[PDB]
A paper describes a structure:
Carotenoid cleavage dioxygenases (CCDs) are non-heme FeII enzymes that catalyze the oxidative cleavage of alkene bonds in carotenoids, stilbenoids, and related compounds. pmcCarotenoid cleavage dioxygenases (CCDs) are a broadly distributed superfamily of enzymes that catalyze the reaction of dioxygen (O2) with carotenoids, stilbenoids, and related redox-active polyenes. These enzymes use a mononuclear non-heme FeII center to activate O2 for reaction with a specific alkene group in the substrate, generating carbonyl-containing products of importance in biological processes such as hormonal signaling and light detection. Unlike many mononuclear non-heme iron dioxygenases that coordinate their FeII centers using a 2-His, 1-Glu/Asp “facial triad” motif, CCDs use a 4-His cluster, three of which hydrogen bond to second-sphere carboxylates (Glu/Asp). While one coordination position is occupied by a solvent ligand as demonstrated by several crystallographic and spectroscopic investigations, the other is vacant because of apparent occlusion by a nearby methyl group of a semiconserved, second sphere residue (i.e., Thr/Val/Ile), making CCDs five-coordinate (5C) in their resting FeII states.
To investigate whether reduction in side-chain volume would allow solvent binding at the sixth position, site-directed mutagenesis was used to introduce a T151G substitution in CAO1, thereby opening the maximal potential space for ligand coordination. Globally, the structure of T151G FeII–CAO1 closely resembled the wildtype protein with an overall Cα RMSD of 0.125 Å. Two discrete density map peaks were observed in proximity to the iron center indicating two coordinated solvent molecules. One of these (solvent 1) corresponded to the normally bound water molecule located trans to His197. The second peak, located across from His313, was also satisfactorily modeled with a water molecule (solvent 2). The newly accessible space for solvent coordination was readily apparent in the solvent-excluded surface of the T151G FeII–CAO1 variant. The average Fe–O bond lengths for solvents 1 and 2 were 2.52 ± 0.15 Å and 2.80 ± 0.10 Å, respectively, indicating relatively weak coordination. The ∠His197Nε–Fe–H2O for solvent 1 is 170°, whereas solvent 2 is distorted away from a trans geometry with an ∠His313Nε–Fe–H2O of ∼153°. This distortion arises from the solvent avoiding a steric clash with a nearby Ala196 side chain as well as its engagement in a weak hydrogen bonding interaction with the main chain carbonyl oxygen of residue 151. In the stilbenoid-cleaving CAO1, the volume of the side chain was maximally reduced by making a Thr to Gly substitution.
Numbering used by the authors:
A (entry chain D), B (entry chain A): 30 to 526
Write the structure that this text describes.
């Protein structure tokens, strides 16, 4: 077989990106300042973290084994529990004590035949007493919220109609439904999208099969009262390329950013309208809602070139690292309209941004608060001379959070410091009676001075000030998505406003 | 109550001495070089590591909660398992989420009444299918060698005659006995020493009660074929001082270094002879044996002043940090002699040394190989300018290992590098047929450049060369004693030569 390296090599596993690969507990974490005693619940986050050195050189960040962190908060005390998802990949590679799964989303490069290729490293969400560890090429993996034990691959009591489950399901605060989909829903290179939803009782509600114009990456989607929206990243899959050992994804400069709109209830596949936004990269969705006119307001990160530059076009054409900026875009869509081309979006701020969060109590409805990561290149904000040599590569950089008030237009910016970078933030309602976007923000910091991770707790009253700084004595590798599960929420999700 | 700090403060918990307090697993550790495939067994080590910040300012290193590391070796692969001993202290402080036990060995400063005050941080040894986590003020805590689960306080099936069990029991390679003792054997300030042994079947053999001339610290002891030897450190205990909030230990410049010799079998308390070595500090025993003349050769680290300077005499008189050197001393004792004063010892090498190990296959018999820690102050060996600001305080420093051949007088010195310090080494016989001191040496390194720990594997054929360097992505806080449990040894201890 291809030889298995016995230590990590390359930029993707250097400095702060070096895997730690620890599982277990650190209770009673060190705290500078004071954690508000009223905060009770768990911050779950997932990071890609290769358990074994890959036989694939410069294996992308997105292909690392999912490791779940839980920060358990009560009476101003916090404990860390950390455990890898027991994917088929993790278990078989652990047994063999060497890497067996090959290139990102290319089964033809695997050293053994996998049934499930999930790294379960995309997202970690709460649904009906379980954690779901999500990866958009696979079904979810169900886990115990208390122990982080893996129960196994989850098929919703045999109801799961799709081979694939999105990393970005939406939770309706009114209906208590989990609104889902999968792309490549019938296997590698298929244009089949399965749109499906589950009621709070766990019974499947919607199941609509539709066809994508191209086999494009649909990473995120949006849900309104009456519509579901599928923005397609112009990364396109050719299974014949994959069979020769090629990349799953290849940029296509010749296609628009397709935005499919489907009626949310009682629709057929043919009811989908594929609107055509100006060519660009579909980033993460903040939220979507229908205004008084009944028009969809789609608010999402949007770039004008390939953010995933490591997957260029057929002739290897694409941007360089740190060249492409994503901006907080508003797209207006009308399902009634027969005009497929969409106008350029309006931009809500000028910041290079990503990883937008709202108060999920107004998810699928009009929101007036967004929290998002920013990358400010303004001199001095990040000491690049100090950070970059310690940073490694393969992961996006954010050197602050921003809070946008959509009513007033006021922006607050949290800057952790010149030698610190942030992950995706979570929002915690102050209590069940709290106004929209009123409460606490938590965000994991990479401290490049200490080569340690920190968990910052902010009050939305003043986002510039750390109320508490939780000091971890180890590195948590830069990760992807995380979620708050409040103790006062019986189904793990907050009550509607 | 005295307020509980929510983060660690002071030199004893700064830099590399900052508690990590992690429990769990890191499997398939990164390896530079090659671990010999024939090595099969576990390296167990214990470190003091406070689980919660103390309410006692500048709490000594020796008062930290015992955390057990296990390095499990097979076919050139190694896994780390890490778990705290579930002492009464650990469990009750974990329940309270704050420190409750007060000053080192002073129950009158405790915020609650403890039955057992053990931190189980002294040593971790194998006996009859269990680990024993040792602390000289308490009985052992029994643990699972595989899972590091704590079974609880161990009383040897109700046979334990003493309130105290030494951190330095001796394993006779011929008789397969565990030879033990406890000082302060009837509680705080008592001059009672209980000498006791267990046969390989777990039945108690010897139990002799004797009286110490003073209530002095007997940290280590020595066992020969026919004698047991108790060197007393001139640190003396006054319970009346303790009741006023004073130190358990206070140096006494007016007494010799007492060395008690007792017949190993069938003795009474009154059979002990208290010989009087020149005033000095009794360091760790390498080994003792009877020569052809029947005289005891006692080989141990020996200093001329108080190594534990933080416990000075009644008027606060004592040395400064890094001032006192310990030297590899040979004391000659004759149980038959009526002359109590002993001559100054002969010195086997000139090195400032401690933590001596032998091939334990010749324990209690003539040995011709010793491995020990050294601290070379020769300029350039340690980059003090770089290390000291990152080092913290409270723990002894060693910047190399030495192998002494007692026959030839040849010394090999392992220097890990200018920005690395060592812990206590272990010796592993190459195989069951290997000559004395022939095989492998392992030692945990503190790497002050990476602020990470490393486990170095050396061949005794050439101690200057690292055969393998196991790269931990976390710090293991400087610790005390560790032991090898070879897979080929059913009772966990090597066969006699
Ligand atoms: Cl890798
Ligand atoms: Cl599991
Ligand atoms: Cl992160
Ligand atoms: Cl402390
Ligand atoms: Cl336990
Ligand atoms: Cl150590
Ligand atoms: Fe995502
Ligand atoms: Fe010791």
């Amino acid at each position: 077989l291809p030889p298995a390296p016995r230590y990590f090599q390359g930029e993707n596993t250097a400095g702060f990106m070096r895997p730690v690969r620890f599982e277990g507990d650190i209770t009673n974490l060190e705290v500078v300042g004071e954690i508000p005693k009223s905060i009770e619940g768990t911050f779950y986050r997932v990071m890609p973290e290769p358990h074994l050195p890959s036989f694939i050189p410069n294996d992308p960040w997105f292909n690392g084994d999912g490791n779940i962190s839980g920060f358990y908060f009560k009476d101003g005390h916090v404990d860390l529990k950390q455990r890898y998802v027991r994917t088929e990949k993790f278990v078989r590679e652990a047994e063999a004590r060497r890497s067996l799964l090959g290139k990102y989303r290319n089964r033809y490069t695997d050293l053994v035949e996998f049934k499930i290729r999930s790294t379960a490293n995309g997202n970690i969400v709460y649904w009906r007493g379980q954690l779901l560890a999500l990866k958009e090429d696979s079904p979810p993996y169900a886990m115990d919220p208390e122990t982080l034990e893996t129960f196994g691959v989850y098929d919703f009591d045999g109801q799961l109609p799709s081979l694939t489950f999105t990393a970005h399901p939406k939770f309706d605060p009114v209906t208590r439904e989990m609104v889902c989909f999968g792309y490549e829903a019938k296997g590698d290179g298929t244009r089949d999208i399965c749109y499906y939803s589950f009621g709070p009782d766990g019974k499947i509600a919607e199941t609509v099969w539709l066809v994508s114009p191209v086999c494009g990456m649909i990473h995120d989607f949006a849900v309104t009262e009456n519509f579901v929206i599928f923005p397609i990243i112009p990364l396109v899959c050719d299974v014949e390329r994959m069979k020769q050992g090629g990349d799953h994804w290849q940029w296509d400069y010749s296609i628009p950013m397709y935005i499919g709109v489907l009626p949310r209830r009682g629709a057929q596949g043919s009811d989908v309208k594929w609107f055509e936004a100006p060519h660009g990269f579909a980033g993460h969705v903040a939220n979507a809602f229908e205004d008084d006119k009944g028009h969809i307001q789609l608010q999402m990160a949007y770039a004008k070139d390939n953010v995933f530059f490591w997957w260029p076009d057929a002739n290897g054409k694409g941007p360089r690292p740190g060249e492409v900026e994503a901006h907080f875009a508003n797209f207006v869509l009308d399902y009634q309209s027969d005009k497929l081309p969409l106008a350029e979006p309006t931009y809500l701020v000028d910041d290079d941004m990503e990883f937008p969060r709202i108060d999920d109590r107004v998810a699928t409805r009009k929101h007036k608060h967004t929290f998002f990561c920013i990358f400010d290149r303004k001199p001095g904000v990040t000491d690049f001379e100090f950070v970059m040599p310690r940073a490694g590569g393969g992961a996006p950089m954010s050197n602050g959070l921003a809070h946008l008030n959509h009513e007033t237009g006021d922006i607050q910016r949290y800057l952790p410091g010149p030698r610190k970078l942030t992950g995706e933030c979570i929002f915690i309602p102050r209590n069940s009676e709290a106004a929209e976007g009123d409460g606490y923000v938590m965000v994991l910091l990479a401290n490049y001075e200490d080569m340690c991770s920190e968990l910052a707790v902010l009050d939305t009253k003043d986002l510039t000030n750390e109320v508490a700084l939780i000091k971890l004595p180890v590195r948590l590798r830069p990760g992807l998505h995380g979620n708050w599960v409040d103790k006062s929420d019986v189904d793990g999700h907050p009550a509607p406003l």
